[PDB]
Amino acid sequence: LLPPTIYIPYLKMLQGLANGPQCAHYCFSLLKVNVSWEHFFHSLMLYHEHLRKDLQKEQDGLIAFLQLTSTIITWSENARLALCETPVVVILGLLQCSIPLKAELLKTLAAFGKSPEIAASLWQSLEYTILQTVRIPSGIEVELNEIESRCEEYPLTRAFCQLISTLVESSFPSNLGAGLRPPGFDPYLQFLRDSVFRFRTRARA
Amino acid sequence: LLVEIERFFKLHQEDQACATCLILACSTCDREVSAWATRAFFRYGGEAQMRFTTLP
16 A cells, blocks of 8 residues: 555554564565565655755655664664665765654664674764764864754754764774864764753753 | 775885875776775875875
């Protein structure tokens, strides 16, 4: 069933079905072997182009698409890399667009992040995706601004934190941000000053 | 070596690596990836690794 609304509920229903580590595996196979994962990313890619070229129905569909990818990627193993490489590139592109959604893709991205060394593609995406627009003077504040400009809303931040929590778990590239800015991990922690400084003054416990 | 060019660097030397990097960038019928990477190496060297520089 193709109708956009049926299609989105289908995605949601399957997410529910994906529950066990075991079920999640089947859901993985369902798309991979006997709609394919590729079709799914394609849809996301297409929406991305339409969104940017343009500059509720879509939110329904996209939100569902993400809800599903998230559910499985979380409950999976070596398979995670396979989905990772593939939604990773597309998801990154989607994040660049404004979207309401930003947070959600960040949550999914995080699920994709692997335990090992091959974090690097992800860190580059994140740094590039904060760094790109911002103009950084030689001081600290300008760096904070880069993050603040991009991570405008609450969902954006929570998603960002989940992704960061995952990447920071155990590793990252040397001389990160080289070329564009003063390198290193430090500015990210500064950003948290913006966050947990503020937290005390939340809304909404 | 395009993906690791240290090995080239080690044997050949930095200068030669730069020269070859320039040729690959300019070189015609090359994939964009190759040209861009070589351009990147030429321009920026290896990030947080080999730096590209005048030294007193």
